[PDB]
Structure formats: structure tokens, C-alpha cells
């Protein structure tokens, strides 16, 4: 239901997934040639089949493929700086693929929104879903849009006619947690006759 979910969520409202007490088979993921990009930092995805983690987490959203390269520790992404901050010492894997067939409409699909304004970058894995009208200066907006009174969000529109640099991409990022606690995820490789 993470990779074959029919709809995803917007980047400002990125869902928060917990994986524990189950066996993770990443071979189903990296063997399939249906994902545009496959980046893992500080960890070997092939060797993930015989390692254990205290807790494994996933995040899913849809953004532009050109914005994907922004997501990296030590780097700043225009969306990422206000939608998804990532620690420098992060360890995990990032996978993304195009969704032109399912996330593009001839008339456009404007239902997906995104955070646009804030006065400081958020902390790693910190979300902001407040709908309060952004203030561009000293004069209070008082909840009425207009000059210097900007709605905090805006939308994305996508069409099949959009090019490769314009098509939406479905993004999945995996984060692994290893506290001073027993692990909850194991691998099935050692099964034999």
C-alpha cells in the first residue's frame, strides 16, 4: 500500500509511515526496473536483505523530477527547505519514478498543493500544515488575500503534453532508525531446506 497506493499526498502534507514487526524484502524494490531513480546514502541496498533495524520508516509524496536531485544531506531544496528538511547525518534510501499516466490530466490535476512561504527553514522531518495567511511585511493581513497578502499554499497542474522536465514523479524515501533498543525488522534470506 506504499508503492501501489492509488493516490499519494502533497509534499506539505507528506504522510508518516512506520514499519516494524515485519520482514522487509527490498529485493522486490531494487530488482524491478520500474523506478526512475534509486539513491541510497550510507547504506548498501543489496545488503539490506540480511540486516536488522530498530525501526524503519517511509515517506511518500509527489513532486517534479527536476526537484528530486535537491533532496540530499548537505543540500538545500526550494521545496525541501520549506516542506521536507533532512539531517546531514541521515542514512537511508531514496526511490522515485514518473507518474505522468496516473498524476496528469488533460485539463490538469490542481488538487495537489504545496507549502510556499515561511520565515525560517524547518527542522529535519518537521512538517507544517498551517493554513494561516502569510504576511509579506509589517501590515497585518487580517485573513484577507491581496497585495502582500498571500495564501500560504498554491497548487500544481500537470498535463500529458508536459515534457520530461515537467512531468510529475512519485517519490518514496526510506529512513532507518537504530536506537538502543531491540530490532523489529529482519530478513528472510537464511531460509533453506
Amino acid at each position, epitope marked *: 500500500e506504499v508503492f501501489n497506493a492509488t493516490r499519494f499526498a502533497s509534499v506539505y502534507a507528506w504522510n508518516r509511515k512506520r514499519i516494524s514487526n515485519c520482514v522487509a524484502d527490498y529485493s522486490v524494490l531494487y530488482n524491478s526496473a520500474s523506478f526512475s531513480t534509486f539513491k541510497c546514502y550510507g547504506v548498501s541496498p543489496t545488503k539490506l536483505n540480511d540486516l536488522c533495524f530498530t525501526n524503519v520508516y517511509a515517506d511518500s509524496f509527489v513532486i517534479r523530477g527536476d526537484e528530486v536531485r535537491q533532496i540530499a544531506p548537505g543540500q538545500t531544496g526550494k521545496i525541501a527547505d520549506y516542506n521536507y528538511k533532512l539531517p546531514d547525518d541521515f542514512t537511508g534510501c531514496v526511490i522515485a519514478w514518473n507518474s505522468n499516466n496516473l498524476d496528469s490530466k488533460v485539463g490538469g490535476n490542481y488538487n495537489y498543493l504545496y507549502r*510556499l512561504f*515561511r520565515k525560517s*527553514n524547518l527542522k529535519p522531518f518537521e512538517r507544517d500544515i498551517s493554513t494561516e495567511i502569510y504576511q*509579506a511585511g509589517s501590515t497585518p493581513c487580517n485573513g484577507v488575500e491581496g497585495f502582500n497578502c498571500y495564501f500560504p499554499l498554491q497548487s500544481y497542474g500537470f498535463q500529458p503534453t508536459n*515534457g520530461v522536465g515537467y512531468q510529475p514523479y512519485r517519490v518514496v524515501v526510506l529512513s532507518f532508525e537504530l536506537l538502543h533498543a531491540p530490532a523489529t525488522v529482519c530478513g528472510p534470506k537464511k531460509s533453506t531446506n
Partner: antibody
Amino acid sequence: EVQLVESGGGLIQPGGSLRLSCAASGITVSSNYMSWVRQAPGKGLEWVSVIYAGGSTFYADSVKGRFTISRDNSKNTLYLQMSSLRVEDTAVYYCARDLDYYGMDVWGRGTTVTVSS
Amino acid sequence: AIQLTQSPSSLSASVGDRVTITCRASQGISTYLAWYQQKPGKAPKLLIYGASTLQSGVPSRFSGSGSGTDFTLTISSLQPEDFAAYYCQQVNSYPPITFGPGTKVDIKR
């Protein structure tokens, strides 16, 4: 009113190092996004850089090892320090303010620097 | 990268004459270009949002359209001060945003 107050440069040989500035007389600088402009005479206007409310910086290809931009909120002032100038760098340069990412609001009158013999 | 050309490179119109300026793209953008007005010795000025969204304080005589790659501008009733030059600017992505040839629109009185 809304207006931009710009520092002003001068005549400098190639490779010179200088710092400029621009204060926003319309709105508090910390509450908005802004930039500067490069305009080669009779050619056009080029994006160069921008600072973010989180302090983030972002350069153009030609200004990565050449230009640096800073801010003082108390002075309502956005700065710019240049280095490693070239002769062709002689061109009128303007200032950009972005009430929105997707456009432009108020142009500065521009500051000029000459690099010639 | 996206390459742009503005048509035409000069134009001849009278007072109130319908002036239509068009730019073309090589790649498919949806709503991320800007039409701007810049008189000589004068600063550029915001004209449109998206393709057909009016800005603040602009007379309704100014008009524009265009999507996909072919990108247009329109003046419903030409006005004497409209003697200027028109160009384009994209949104985000690379800094340069190259455009087409220079243009001179001439008023007929």
C-alpha cells in the same frame, strides 16, 4: 511608497574586489525575497542569485566563485561582495525584489561598474 | 534547456491598432513564463500572471495568452505611450532564460 535604495560602484580593473548593498524602502527585508540583476548593454537581463528566509543562498554559474550576497535585517539592507572581476563585467546592474517566486515587483535604478583600460 | 524566439523583430501600428506579439518555446511549459514591459532608459514592469491573469493597476487594454510552447501578447487598444520593447522571462530553473530578436513597435499618428 515602495522603492529600492542602491549602493553604487565605480571604475575597477579586472580582478578587483568590492562590496555593494541595497536597502528596501518599501517593506521589511526579512519578510520578502530579493535578488540582484546583471544587464549586459543591449543584450538582456540575467538571473544571478537569491537569499531565502532561512538564510539559504543560491548562485548562478558565473557568480559562484565571483560574487557573494549578505543581509542586515536591522539596516533593512541586502549586500553584495564581488571578486575576480573581468573586463566584460562592465554593464549596468539592477536589483531584484520578489514578493512572489514567480515574478518581480520593484526595480532598483541600478549601480554601474566599469572595467576597462 | 528551453529556447525562445519572439515574433516579430519590429512592428508597425497606429493609435488603437491591435498589436499582437508572440513568443515560441522548444519545450512544453504550462504556466511558467512572464511577459514584461521595459521602455528604453526605463525599468521592466510586471504585465501578466500565468498567461491571462491581470495584475494591479494595469489598464484592461493590455492582454495576453499562450500555452504549451506558443506564447502570445495582445493590446486591445494601442496607446501612444506603448512605444517600448517586449520580452519574456521563465520561472525558476536556470538563470539565463534566453529570448529572441530585438523589436521596435512603431506608432502611427
